[PDB]
Amino acid sequence: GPPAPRHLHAQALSDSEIQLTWKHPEALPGPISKYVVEVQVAGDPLWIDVDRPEETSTIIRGLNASTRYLFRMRASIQGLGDWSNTVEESTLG
Amino acid sequence: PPAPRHLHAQALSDSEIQLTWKHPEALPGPISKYVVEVQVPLWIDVDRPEETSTIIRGLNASTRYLFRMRASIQGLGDWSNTVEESTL
Numbered sequence: 352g353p354p355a356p357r358h359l360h361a362q363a364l365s366d367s368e369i370q371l372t373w374k375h376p377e378a379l380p381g382p383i384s385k386y387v388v389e390v391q392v393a394g395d396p397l398w399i400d401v402d403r404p405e406e407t408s409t410i411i412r413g414l415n416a417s418t419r420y421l422f423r424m425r426a427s428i429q430g431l432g433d434w435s436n437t438v439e440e441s442t443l444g
Numbered sequence: 445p446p447a448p449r450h451l452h453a454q455a456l457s458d459s460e461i462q463l464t465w466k467h468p469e470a471l472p473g474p475i476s477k478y479v480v481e482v483q484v485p486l487w488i489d490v491d492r493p494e495e496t497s498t499i500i501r502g503l504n505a506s507t508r509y510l511f512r513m514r515a516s517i518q519g520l521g522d523w524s525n526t527v528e529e530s531t532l
């Protein structure tokens with residue numbers, strides 16, 4: 352059960368890109384795996400996965416000029432499943 | 445997430461190795477992806493979870509390879525405050 356990242360703010364570096372700045376929530380139940388950012392116009396919406404969870408900002412590339420956007424974020428905790436049976440298979444010539 | 449049962453392996457010739465597995469029964473909710481480990485370690489997960497087989501690339505010939513898999517579930521937390529920003 353991951354809480355949302357607090358204190359969100361975006362600012363456009365160029366007409367075709369906007370960087371997004373966020374902060375860590377204080378007490379979190381367990382570690383998080385990644386962040387998920389989404390872009391919408393929004394009169395379908397695109398999802399962009401931020402790989403490194405230890406990150407406080409990222410730059411959204413590939414946007415349209417002179418267009419307004421709305422952004423949202425969420426923390427993600429992936430639960431690893433049990434390992435399956437081990438199998439062996441060698442590669443030959 | 446329960447482990448994917450009945451795992452199987454079968455290589456091509458001298459490059460790629462293909463794996464095959466049966467889905468696990470009785471699982472609480474969906475799963476996000478299947479993670480696969482390859483020791484000559486390196487984890488290489490399959491993006492699409494509704495899958496029964498995948499191709500393992502990058503393998504030197506004449507080498508004893510072994511595989512193991514596991515399921516995963518991305519616990520997507522709550523969304524953050526919505527924010528607006530203009531471009532020009």
